[PDB]
PDB file of C-alpha atoms and ligand atoms in Angstrom:
ATOM      1  CA  UNK A   1       0.000   0.000   0.000  1.00  0.00           C
ATOM      2  CA  UNK A   2       2.763   2.455   0.949  1.00  0.00           C
ATOM      3  CA  UNK A   3       6.107   1.813  -0.749  1.00  0.00           C
ATOM      4  CA  UNK A   4       7.916  -0.649   1.485  1.00  0.00           C
ATOM      5  CA  UNK A   5      10.769  -1.874  -0.669  1.00  0.00           C
ATOM      6  CA  UNK A   6      12.809  -0.439  -3.549  1.00  0.00           C
ATOM      7  CA  UNK A   7      15.007  -2.055  -6.085  1.00  0.00           C
ATOM      8  CA  UNK A   8      17.836   0.324  -7.173  1.00  0.00           C
ATOM      9  CA  UNK A   9      20.882  -0.871  -9.074  1.00  0.00           C
ATOM     10  CA  UNK A  10      21.139  -4.418  -7.866  1.00  0.00           C
ATOM     11  CA  UNK A  11      20.170  -3.721  -4.220  1.00  0.00           C
ATOM     12  CA  UNK A  12      16.768  -4.076  -2.751  1.00  0.00           C
ATOM     13  CA  UNK A  13      16.142  -1.914   0.380  1.00  0.00           C
ATOM     14  CA  UNK A  14      13.210  -2.023   2.827  1.00  0.00           C
ATOM     15  CA  UNK A  15      11.667   1.374   3.766  1.00  0.00           C
ATOM     16  CA  UNK A  16      12.011   2.884   7.208  1.00  0.00           C
ATOM     17  CA  UNK A  17       9.375   5.508   6.735  1.00  0.00           C
ATOM     18  CA  UNK A  18       6.431   6.669   4.628  1.00  0.00           C
ATOM     19  CA  UNK A  19       7.365   8.537   1.466  1.00  0.00           C
ATOM     20  CA  UNK A  20       4.584  10.256  -0.542  1.00  0.00           C
ATOM     21  CA  UNK A  21       5.260   8.657  -3.969  1.00  0.00           C
ATOM     22  CA  UNK A  22       2.027   8.844  -6.023  1.00  0.00           C
ATOM     23  CA  UNK A  23      -0.452   6.249  -4.703  1.00  0.00           C
ATOM     24  CA  UNK A  24      -0.441   3.792  -7.647  1.00  0.00           C
ATOM     25  CA  UNK A  25       3.361   3.673  -7.082  1.00  0.00           C
ATOM     26  CA  UNK A  26       2.337   1.964  -3.824  1.00  0.00           C
ATOM     27  CA  UNK A  27       2.443  -1.001  -6.253  1.00  0.00           C
ATOM     28  CA  UNK A  28       3.690  -3.477  -3.803  1.00  0.00           C
ATOM     29  CA  UNK A  29       5.779  -1.502  -4.241  1.00  0.00           C
ATOM     30  CA  UNK A  30       8.409  -2.834  -5.102  1.00  0.00           C
ATOM     31  CA  UNK A  31       9.376   0.485  -6.617  1.00  0.00           C
ATOM     32  CA  UNK A  32      12.163   0.128  -9.173  1.00  0.00           C
ATOM     33  CA  UNK A  33      14.517   3.116  -9.378  1.00  0.00           C
ATOM     34  CA  UNK A  34      17.080   3.845 -12.036  1.00  0.00           C
ATOM     35  CA  UNK A  35      20.296   4.203 -10.028  1.00  0.00           C
ATOM     36  CA  UNK A  36      21.587   6.949 -12.301  1.00  0.00           C
ATOM     37  CA  UNK A  37      18.681   9.190 -13.087  1.00  0.00           C
ATOM     38  CA  UNK A  38      16.594   8.004 -10.056  1.00  0.00           C
ATOM     39  CA  UNK A  39      13.471   7.668 -12.143  1.00  0.00           C
ATOM     40  CA  UNK A  40      10.860   5.603 -10.292  1.00  0.00           C
ATOM     41  CA  UNK A  41       8.931   2.829 -12.067  1.00  0.00           C
ATOM     42  CA  UNK A  42       6.195   0.352 -11.152  1.00  0.00           C
ATOM     43  CA  UNK A  43       7.215  -2.894 -12.827  1.00  0.00           C
ATOM     44  CA  UNK A  44      10.307  -4.967 -13.497  1.00  0.00           C
ATOM     45  CA  UNK A  45       9.402  -4.770 -17.250  1.00  0.00           C
ATOM     46  CA  UNK A  46       9.305  -0.945 -17.404  1.00  0.00           C
ATOM     47  CA  UNK A  47      12.447  -1.072 -15.184  1.00  0.00           C
ATOM     48  CA  UNK A  48      14.301  -3.370 -17.572  1.00  0.00           C
ATOM     49  CA  UNK A  49      13.204  -1.297 -20.633  1.00  0.00           C
ATOM     50  CA  UNK A  50      14.436   1.874 -19.001  1.00  0.00           C
ATOM     51  CA  UNK A  51      17.804   0.387 -18.014  1.00  0.00           C
ATOM     52  CA  UNK A  52      18.494  -0.520 -21.676  1.00  0.00           C
ATOM     53  CA  UNK A  53      17.430   2.941 -22.807  1.00  0.00           C
ATOM     54  CA  UNK A  54      18.666   5.412 -20.142  1.00  0.00           C
ATOM     55  CA  UNK A  55      21.948   6.966 -21.064  1.00  0.00           C
ATOM     56  CA  UNK A  56      22.799   8.585 -17.702  1.00  0.00           C
ATOM     57  CA  UNK A  57      25.803   6.983 -15.924  1.00  0.00           C
ATOM     58  CA  UNK A  58      26.302   9.467 -13.132  1.00  0.00           C
ATOM     59  CA  UNK A  59      24.541  12.315 -11.371  1.00  0.00           C
ATOM     60  CA  UNK A  60      23.783  15.636 -13.157  1.00  0.00           C
ATOM     61  CA  UNK A  61      25.611  18.828 -12.184  1.00  0.00           C
ATOM     62  CA  UNK A  62      29.287  19.508 -11.730  1.00  0.00           C
ATOM     63  CA  UNK A  63      31.742  16.968 -10.323  1.00  0.00           C
ATOM     64  CA  UNK A  64      33.323  19.223  -7.629  1.00  0.00           C
ATOM     65  CA  UNK A  65      35.220  16.353  -5.973  1.00  0.00           C
ATOM     66  CA  UNK A  66      37.099  13.326  -7.202  1.00  0.00           C
ATOM     67  CA  UNK A  67      39.720  11.180  -5.330  1.00  0.00           C
ATOM     68  CA  UNK A  68      40.255   7.624  -6.369  1.00  0.00           C
ATOM     69  CA  UNK A  69      36.736   6.379  -7.220  1.00  0.00           C
ATOM     70  CA  UNK A  70      34.965   8.666  -4.778  1.00  0.00           C
ATOM     71  CA  UNK A  71      33.192  11.659  -6.222  1.00  0.00           C
ATOM     72  CA  UNK A  72      30.723  14.357  -5.289  1.00  0.00           C
ATOM     73  CA  UNK A  73      28.353  15.996  -7.775  1.00  0.00           C
ATOM     74  CA  UNK A  74      26.897  19.415  -6.912  1.00  0.00           C
ATOM     75  CA  UNK A  75      23.285  19.630  -8.162  1.00  0.00           C
ATOM     76  CA  UNK A  76      21.206  22.842  -7.930  1.00  0.00           C
ATOM     77  CA  UNK A  77      17.579  21.863  -7.383  1.00  0.00           C
ATOM     78  CA  UNK A  78      16.377  24.837  -9.490  1.00  0.00           C
ATOM     79  CA  UNK A  79      18.296  23.408 -12.488  1.00  0.00           C
ATOM     80  CA  UNK A  80      17.631  19.678 -12.107  1.00  0.00           C
ATOM     81  CA  UNK A  81      14.210  19.744 -10.569  1.00  0.00           C
ATOM     82  CA  UNK A  82      12.981  16.273 -11.537  1.00  0.00           C
ATOM     83  CA  UNK A  83      16.184  14.494 -10.462  1.00  0.00           C
ATOM     84  CA  UNK A  84      16.147  16.381  -7.176  1.00  0.00           C
ATOM     85  CA  UNK A  85      12.437  15.588  -6.627  1.00  0.00           C
ATOM     86  CA  UNK A  86      13.217  11.871  -7.304  1.00  0.00           C
ATOM     87  CA  UNK A  87      16.075  12.020  -4.791  1.00  0.00           C
ATOM     88  CA  UNK A  88      13.927  13.609  -2.086  1.00  0.00           C
ATOM     89  CA  UNK A  89      11.295  10.852  -2.481  1.00  0.00           C
ATOM     90  CA  UNK A  90      14.025   8.238  -2.197  1.00  0.00           C
ATOM     91  CA  UNK A  91      15.528   9.962   0.924  1.00  0.00           C
ATOM     92  CA  UNK A  92      12.178  10.325   2.673  1.00  0.00           C
ATOM     93  CA  UNK A  93      12.054   6.496   2.812  1.00  0.00           C
ATOM     94  CA  UNK A  94      14.828   6.712   5.405  1.00  0.00           C
ATOM     95  CA  UNK A  95      14.038  10.074   7.064  1.00  0.00           C
ATOM     96  CA  UNK A  96      11.472  10.484   9.595  1.00  0.00           C
ATOM     97  CA  UNK A  97      10.532  13.949   8.355  1.00  0.00           C
ATOM     98  CA  UNK A  98      11.487  16.113   5.324  1.00  0.00           C
ATOM     99  CA  UNK A  99      10.356  19.336   3.594  1.00  0.00           C
ATOM    100  CA  UNK A 100       7.890  18.799   0.639  1.00  0.00           C
ATOM    101  CA  UNK A 101       9.534  16.661  -1.959  1.00  0.00           C
ATOM    102  CA  UNK A 102       8.599  18.839  -4.954  1.00  0.00           C
ATOM    103  CA  UNK A 103      10.030  22.045  -3.444  1.00  0.00           C
ATOM    104  CA  UNK A 104      13.705  21.429  -4.315  1.00  0.00           C
ATOM    105  CA  UNK A 105      14.524  24.823  -5.783  1.00  0.00           C
ATOM    106  CA  UNK A 106      15.590  26.359  -2.410  1.00  0.00           C
ATOM    107  CA  UNK A 107      18.277  23.604  -2.033  1.00  0.00           C
ATOM    108  CA  UNK A 108      21.543  22.418  -3.540  1.00  0.00           C
ATOM    109  CA  UNK A 109      22.242  18.713  -3.294  1.00  0.00           C
ATOM    110  CA  UNK A 110      25.677  17.133  -2.973  1.00  0.00           C
ATOM    111  CA  UNK A 111      25.620  13.573  -4.318  1.00  0.00           C
ATOM    112  CA  UNK A 112      28.264  11.141  -3.215  1.00  0.00           C
ATOM    113  CA  UNK A 113      29.056   8.213  -5.584  1.00  0.00           C
ATOM    114  CA  UNK A 114      31.486   5.297  -5.927  1.00  0.00           C
ATOM    115  CA  UNK A 115      32.844   5.026  -9.437  1.00  0.00           C
ATOM    116  CA  UNK A 116      33.627   1.865 -11.412  1.00  0.00           C
ATOM    117  CA  UNK A 117      33.741   0.755 -15.102  1.00  0.00           C
ATOM    118  CA  UNK A 118      29.879   0.775 -15.281  1.00  0.00           C
ATOM    119  CA  UNK A 119      29.331   4.296 -13.930  1.00  0.00           C
ATOM    120  CA  UNK A 120      29.012   6.370 -10.764  1.00  0.00           C
ATOM    121  CA  UNK A 121      26.837   4.589  -8.158  1.00  0.00           C
ATOM    122  CA  UNK A 122      25.000   6.723  -5.673  1.00  0.00           C
ATOM    123  CA  UNK A 123      26.063   6.142  -2.080  1.00  0.00           C
ATOM    124  CA  UNK A 124      24.329   8.973  -0.237  1.00  0.00           C
ATOM    125  CA  UNK A 125      23.988  12.770  -0.352  1.00  0.00           C
ATOM    126  CA  UNK A 126      23.427  15.831   1.707  1.00  0.00           C
ATOM    127  CA  UNK A 127      21.247  18.784   0.918  1.00  0.00           C
ATOM    128  CA  UNK A 128      21.827  22.457   1.859  1.00  0.00           C
ATOM    129  CA  UNK A 129      19.429  25.432   1.788  1.00  0.00           C
ATOM    130  CA  UNK A 130      20.813  28.188  -0.435  1.00  0.00           C
ATOM    131  CA  UNK A 131      19.597  30.534   2.337  1.00  0.00           C
ATOM    132  CA  UNK A 132      19.238  29.147   5.865  1.00  0.00           C
ATOM    133  CA  UNK A 133      17.336  31.366   8.351  1.00  0.00           C
ATOM    134  CA  UNK A 134      18.995  29.262  11.128  1.00  0.00           C
ATOM    135  CA  UNK A 135      22.585  29.048   9.782  1.00  0.00           C
ATOM    136  CA  UNK A 136      22.252  25.356   8.859  1.00  0.00           C
ATOM    137  CA  UNK A 137      24.991  23.990   6.636  1.00  0.00           C
ATOM    138  CA  UNK A 138      23.209  20.714   6.051  1.00  0.00           C
ATOM    139  CA  UNK A 139      19.436  20.273   5.731  1.00  0.00           C
ATOM    140  CA  UNK A 140      19.297  16.433   5.337  1.00  0.00           C
ATOM    141  CA  UNK A 141      22.121  13.895   5.189  1.00  0.00           C
ATOM    142  CA  UNK A 142      21.753  10.173   4.200  1.00  0.00           C
ATOM    143  CA  UNK A 143      23.952   7.153   3.408  1.00  0.00           C
ATOM    144  CA  UNK A 144      21.748   4.496   1.759  1.00  0.00           C
ATOM    145  CA  UNK A 145      21.390   1.501   4.119  1.00  0.00           C
ATOM    146  CA  UNK A 146      23.614  -0.947   2.180  1.00  0.00           C
ATOM    147  CA  UNK A 147      26.562   1.492   2.456  1.00  0.00           C
ATOM    148  CA  UNK A 148      26.034   2.468   6.095  1.00  0.00           C
ATOM    149  CA  UNK A 149      28.717   2.094   8.863  1.00  0.00           C
ATOM    150  CA  UNK A 150      31.616   2.473   6.454  1.00  0.00           C
ATOM    151  CA  UNK A 151      32.578   6.084   6.929  1.00  0.00           C
ATOM    152  CA  UNK A 152      30.414   7.574   4.146  1.00  0.00           C
ATOM    153  CA  UNK A 153      28.224   9.551   6.599  1.00  0.00           C
ATOM    154  CA  UNK A 154      31.264  11.112   8.296  1.00  0.00           C
ATOM    155  CA  UNK A 155      32.748  11.884   4.889  1.00  0.00           C
ATOM    156  CA  UNK A 156      29.599  13.880   3.929  1.00  0.00           C
ATOM    157  CA  UNK A 157      29.571  15.668   7.317  1.00  0.00           C
ATOM    158  CA  UNK A 158      33.293  16.616   6.804  1.00  0.00           C
ATOM    159  CA  UNK A 159      32.495  17.767   3.220  1.00  0.00           C
ATOM    160  CA  UNK A 160      29.692  19.991   4.500  1.00  0.00           C
ATOM    161  CA  UNK A 161      32.203  21.606   6.879  1.00  0.00           C
ATOM    162  CA  UNK A 162      34.721  22.020   4.050  1.00  0.00           C
ATOM    163  CA  UNK A 163      32.083  24.039   2.198  1.00  0.00           C
ATOM    164  CA  UNK A 164      31.497  26.144   5.362  1.00  0.00           C
ATOM    165  CA  UNK A 165      35.203  26.872   5.793  1.00  0.00           C
ATOM    166  CA  UNK A 166      35.531  27.995   2.141  1.00  0.00           C
ATOM    167  CA  UNK A 167      32.544  30.318   2.783  1.00  0.00           C
ATOM    168  CA  UNK A 168      34.303  31.620   5.922  1.00  0.00           C
ATOM    169  CA  UNK A 169      31.367  30.641   7.995  1.00  0.00           C
ATOM    170  CA  UNK A 170      30.351  28.452  10.947  1.00  0.00           C
ATOM    171  CA  UNK A 171      27.403  26.114  10.375  1.00  0.00           C
ATOM    172  CA  UNK A 172      25.394  23.415  12.056  1.00  0.00           C
ATOM    173  CA  UNK A 173      23.082  20.675  10.782  1.00  0.00           C
ATOM    174  CA  UNK A 174      19.373  21.325  10.802  1.00  0.00           C
ATOM    175  CA  UNK A 175      17.516  20.225  14.042  1.00  0.00           C
ATOM    176  CA  UNK A 176      16.153  17.653  15.029  1.00  0.00           C
ATOM    177  CA  UNK A 177      19.044  15.196  14.458  1.00  0.00           C
ATOM    178  CA  UNK A 178      17.915  11.647  14.222  1.00  0.00           C
ATOM    179  CA  UNK A 179      19.538   9.246  16.758  1.00  0.00           C
ATOM    180  CA  UNK A 180      21.920   8.155  13.974  1.00  0.00           C
ATOM    181  CA  UNK A 181      22.604  11.770  13.020  1.00  0.00           C
ATOM    182  CA  UNK A 182      23.459  12.421  16.699  1.00  0.00           C
ATOM    183  CA  UNK A 183      26.001   9.522  16.844  1.00  0.00           C
ATOM    184  CA  UNK A 184      27.616  10.546  13.494  1.00  0.00           C
ATOM    185  CA  UNK A 185      27.950  14.222  14.286  1.00  0.00           C
ATOM    186  CA  UNK A 186      29.199  13.563  17.851  1.00  0.00           C
ATOM    187  CA  UNK A 187      31.719  11.168  16.437  1.00  0.00           C
ATOM    188  CA  UNK A 188      32.960  13.516  13.681  1.00  0.00           C
ATOM    189  CA  UNK A 189      33.000  16.580  15.975  1.00  0.00           C
ATOM    190  CA  UNK A 190      35.083  14.677  18.670  1.00  0.00           C
ATOM    191  CA  UNK A 191      37.623  13.399  16.156  1.00  0.00           C
ATOM    192  CA  UNK A 192      38.081  16.820  14.592  1.00  0.00           C
ATOM    193  CA  UNK A 193      38.326  18.662  17.934  1.00  0.00           C
ATOM    194  CA  UNK A 194      40.726  15.980  19.308  1.00  0.00           C
ATOM    195  CA  UNK A 195      42.974  15.926  16.166  1.00  0.00           C
ATOM    196  CA  UNK A 196      43.086  19.753  16.412  1.00  0.00           C
ATOM    197  CA  UNK A 197      43.925  20.020  20.128  1.00  0.00           C
ATOM    198  CA  UNK A 198      46.781  17.522  20.415  1.00  0.00           C
ATOM    199  CA  UNK A 199      40.536  28.767  22.513  1.00  0.00           C
ATOM    200  CA  UNK A 200      36.900  27.620  21.803  1.00  0.00           C
ATOM    201  CA  UNK A 201      36.470  30.713  19.575  1.00  0.00           C
ATOM    202  CA  UNK A 202      39.615  29.551  17.781  1.00  0.00           C
ATOM    203  CA  UNK A 203      38.460  25.992  17.426  1.00  0.00           C
ATOM    204  CA  UNK A 204      35.285  27.484  15.888  1.00  0.00           C
ATOM    205  CA  UNK A 205      37.223  29.679  13.399  1.00  0.00           C
ATOM    206  CA  UNK A 206      39.402  26.721  12.428  1.00  0.00           C
ATOM    207  CA  UNK A 207      36.748  24.045  11.836  1.00  0.00           C
ATOM    208  CA  UNK A 208      33.518  25.954  11.047  1.00  0.00           C
ATOM    209  CA  UNK A 209      31.846  23.977  13.897  1.00  0.00           C
ATOM    210  CA  UNK A 210      29.650  26.222  16.075  1.00  0.00           C
ATOM    211  CA  UNK A 211      30.755  27.207  19.573  1.00  0.00           C
ATOM    212  CA  UNK A 212      27.604  25.487  20.866  1.00  0.00           C
ATOM    213  CA  UNK A 213      28.552  22.203  19.105  1.00  0.00           C
ATOM    214  CA  UNK A 214      32.144  22.575  20.246  1.00  0.00           C
ATOM    215  CA  UNK A 215      30.985  23.075  23.862  1.00  0.00           C
ATOM    216  CA  UNK A 216      28.708  20.029  23.944  1.00  0.00           C
ATOM    217  CA  UNK A 217      31.380  17.862  22.387  1.00  0.00           C
ATOM    218  CA  UNK A 218      34.086  19.017  24.801  1.00  0.00           C
ATOM    219  CA  UNK A 219      31.747  18.398  27.774  1.00  0.00           C
ATOM    220  CA  UNK A 220      31.206  14.776  26.589  1.00  0.00           C
ATOM    221  CA  UNK A 221      35.004  14.429  26.335  1.00  0.00           C
ATOM    222  CA  UNK A 222      35.265  15.955  29.846  1.00  0.00           C
ATOM    223  CA  UNK A 223      37.491  18.778  28.409  1.00  0.00           C
ATOM    224  CA  UNK A 224      35.627  21.813  29.581  1.00  0.00           C
ATOM    225  CA  UNK A 225      35.331  23.604  32.934  1.00  0.00           C
ATOM    226  CA  UNK A 226      33.287  26.513  34.387  1.00  0.00           C
ATOM    227  CA  UNK A 227      34.727  29.670  35.689  1.00  0.00           C
ATOM    228  CA  UNK A 228      32.014  32.030  36.865  1.00  0.00           C
ATOM    229  CA  UNK A 229      29.626  30.234  34.463  1.00  0.00           C
ATOM    230  CA  UNK A 230      31.914  30.747  31.404  1.00  0.00           C
ATOM    231  CA  UNK A 231      33.072  27.665  29.388  1.00  0.00           C
ATOM    232  CA  UNK A 232      36.804  27.148  29.421  1.00  0.00           C
ATOM    233  CA  UNK A 233      38.755  24.555  27.468  1.00  0.00           C
ATOM    234  CA  UNK A 234      40.475  22.281  29.962  1.00  0.00           C
ATOM    235  CA  UNK A 235      42.765  19.687  28.466  1.00  0.00           C
ATOM    236  CA  UNK A 236      46.170  18.020  28.558  1.00  0.00           C
ATOM    237  CA  UNK A 237      47.977  16.518  25.546  1.00  0.00           C
ATOM    238  CA  UNK A 238      47.751  13.487  27.942  1.00  0.00           C
ATOM    239  CA  UNK A 239      44.409  12.633  26.402  1.00  0.00           C
ATOM    240  CA  UNK A 240      43.432  13.883  23.726  1.00  0.00           C
ATOM    241  CA  UNK A 241      42.810  10.215  23.864  1.00  0.00           C
ATOM    242  CA  UNK A 242      42.473   8.292  20.612  1.00  0.00           C
ATOM    243  CA  UNK A 243      42.026   4.602  21.412  1.00  0.00           C
ATOM    244  CA  UNK A 244      39.081   2.435  20.177  1.00  0.00           C
ATOM    245  CA  UNK A 245      38.908   8.247   9.887  1.00  0.00           C
ATOM    246  CA  UNK A 246      38.280   5.634   7.144  1.00  0.00           C
ATOM    247  CA  UNK A 247      37.638   8.225   4.374  1.00  0.00           C
ATOM    248  CA  UNK A 248      38.416  11.935   4.560  1.00  0.00           C
ATOM    249  CA  UNK A 249      37.997  15.030   2.475  1.00  0.00           C
ATOM    250  CA  UNK A 250      41.187  16.020   0.667  1.00  0.00           C
ATOM    251  CA  UNK A 251      40.904  19.816   0.148  1.00  0.00           C
ATOM    252  CA  UNK A 252      43.264  19.432  -2.849  1.00  0.00           C
ATOM    253  CA  UNK A 253      40.673  17.279  -4.658  1.00  0.00           C
ATOM    254  CA  UNK A 254      37.915  19.768  -4.036  1.00  0.00           C
ATOM    255  CA  UNK A 255      37.036  22.238  -6.784  1.00  0.00           C
ATOM    256  CA  UNK A 256      34.573  24.734  -5.373  1.00  0.00           C
ATOM    257  CA  UNK A 257      34.315  28.441  -4.501  1.00  0.00           C
ATOM    258  CA  UNK A 258      31.754  30.280  -2.275  1.00  0.00           C
TER     259      UNK A 258
HETATM  260  C1  ACO B   1      20.233  16.771   9.908  1.00  0.00           C
HETATM  261  C2  ACO B   1      19.821  15.519   9.557  1.00  0.00           C
HETATM  262  O1  ACO B   1      19.741  15.111   8.291  1.00  0.00           O
HETATM  263  S1  ACO B   1      19.394  14.371  10.680  1.00  0.00           S
HETATM  264  C3  ACO B   1      19.195  12.846   9.762  1.00  0.00           C
HETATM  265  C4  ACO B   1      20.469  12.051   9.474  1.00  0.00           C
HETATM  266  N1  ACO B   1      20.088  10.950   8.575  1.00  0.00           N
HETATM  267  C5  ACO B   1      19.340   9.868   8.787  1.00  0.00           C
HETATM  268  O2  ACO B   1      18.801   9.683   9.873  1.00  0.00           O
HETATM  269  C6  ACO B   1      19.094   8.898   7.611  1.00  0.00           C
HETATM  270  C7  ACO B   1      19.414   7.440   7.964  1.00  0.00           C
HETATM  271  N2  ACO B   1      20.775   7.381   8.543  1.00  0.00           N
HETATM  272  C8  ACO B   1      21.822   7.604   7.832  1.00  0.00           C
HETATM  273  O3  ACO B   1      21.655   7.840   6.525  1.00  0.00           O
HETATM  274  C9  ACO B   1      23.188   7.581   8.479  1.00  0.00           C
HETATM  275  O4  ACO B   1      23.052   6.605   9.524  1.00  0.00           O
HETATM  276  C10 ACO B   1      24.017   8.874   8.912  1.00  0.00           C
HETATM  277  C11 ACO B   1      24.006   9.409   7.454  1.00  0.00           C
HETATM  278  C12 ACO B   1      22.937   9.295   9.907  1.00  0.00           C
HETATM  279  C13 ACO B   1      25.171   7.909   9.324  1.00  0.00           C
HETATM  280  O5  ACO B   1      25.767   7.378   8.133  1.00  0.00           O
HETATM  281  P1  ACO B   1      26.934   6.255   8.014  1.00  0.00           P
HETATM  282  O6  ACO B   1      27.473   6.078   6.642  1.00  0.00           O
HETATM  283  O7  ACO B   1      26.348   5.043   8.668  1.00  0.00           O
HETATM  284  O8  ACO B   1      28.085   6.972   8.925  1.00  0.00           O
HETATM  285  P2  ACO B   1      29.581   6.521   9.314  1.00  0.00           P
HETATM  286  O9  ACO B   1      29.932   5.098   8.945  1.00  0.00           O
HETATM  287  O10 ACO B   1      30.440   7.627   8.876  1.00  0.00           O
HETATM  288  O11 ACO B   1      29.508   6.465  10.924  1.00  0.00           O
HETATM  289  C14 ACO B   1      29.272   7.554  11.840  1.00  0.00           C
HETATM  290  C15 ACO B   1      29.137   7.129  13.322  1.00  0.00           C
HETATM  291  O12 ACO B   1      27.800   6.689  13.663  1.00  0.00           O
HETATM  292  C16 ACO B   1      27.874   5.398  14.288  1.00  0.00           C
HETATM  293  N3  ACO B   1      26.774   4.529  13.876  1.00  0.00           N
HETATM  294  C17 ACO B   1      26.284   4.479  12.628  1.00  0.00           C
HETATM  295  N4  ACO B   1      25.310   3.557  12.602  1.00  0.00           N
HETATM  296  C18 ACO B   1      25.213   3.037  13.857  1.00  0.00           C
HETATM  297  C19 ACO B   1      24.364   1.998  14.479  1.00  0.00           C
HETATM  298  N5  ACO B   1      23.445   1.386  13.696  1.00  0.00           N
HETATM  299  N6  ACO B   1      24.548   1.694  15.810  1.00  0.00           N
HETATM  300  C20 ACO B   1      25.487   2.321  16.550  1.00  0.00           C
HETATM  301  N7  ACO B   1      26.272   3.262  15.991  1.00  0.00           N
HETATM  302  C21 ACO B   1      26.150   3.639  14.670  1.00  0.00           C
HETATM  303  C22 ACO B   1      29.115   4.745  13.713  1.00  0.00           C
HETATM  304  O13 ACO B   1      29.611   3.585  14.443  1.00  0.00           O
HETATM  305  C23 ACO B   1      30.035   5.945  13.682  1.00  0.00           C
HETATM  306  O14 ACO B   1      30.541   6.118  14.998  1.00  0.00           O
HETATM  307  P3  ACO B   1      32.130   5.879  15.220  1.00  0.00           P
HETATM  308  O15 ACO B   1      32.807   7.012  14.501  1.00  0.00           O
HETATM  309  O16 ACO B   1      32.217   5.967  16.734  1.00  0.00           O
HETATM  310  O17 ACO B   1      32.423   4.543  14.519  1.00  0.00           O
HETATM  311 CL1   CL B   2      17.214  -3.518   3.713  1.00  0.00          CL
HETATM  312 ZN1   ZN B   3      17.517   6.458 -15.860  1.00  0.00          ZN
END
């Protein structure tokens, strides 16, 4: 009745949430998505026809990052409306809430793919409001379930902060963070603040992380104290811990200006 499973590429993925695909698309569905253009179809037959016809082998937009077989395509929703609407319907399957799927023009989408001989296979993405009333540098972030727990989510988070640094600005993800968002951000923020430390204003300037996110991270690392209510960094090179990363953003492979 609702879409509960999709076939994309040669993965099938069960839904985590309702996504408002048109009702008849509630086939089973089984919804069958082209992995390159993200067109949604109702039947294996229209799926197989499309696959032999569709000429796309990668996302639209500009490839603003490439290192080994990892790339990021920047995709303005005003210029690739249908693709971006298709993407937002896909993402809503794994996001407990999203803005209206058809209203993509206020956003730019950064699409992460793994590249092989066949083409560039979508791993995940984040979106960003062109203008955020709350200073959000990410609106939604997603690694598709089959690629999760491999470092792709932290890669995207890092990449969003690379864009913030280049724009000489601090940013934070849009609230509320899902429980998995919470774990990923806390993890990335701790690694970055720890690798840096080995001022809170200065940590902010250096990383584009907000002072509020720096403070809450430092508290959870026990590296902050109170002096007449004011938050003071309190640490030793002693630890600055690092016991129990996999893919990082190389600024040299990034081709983007503010
Ligand atoms: C602003 C917002 O968009 S909030 C919404 C965020 N997105 C979602 O909720 C969509 C569904 N979830 C996801 O797409 C992802 O889980 C993200 C994008 C939230 C995480 O993506 P991943 O590719 O799994 O991230 P990655 O492998 O980089 O791991 C990040 C951290 O989260 C932890 N984590 C990820 N999944 C789990 C899990 N199932 N159980 C426990 N910890 C987990 C990882 O172990 C890692 O912590 P570590 O650094 O201590 O190892
Ligand atoms: Cl699944
Ligand atoms: Zn296609």
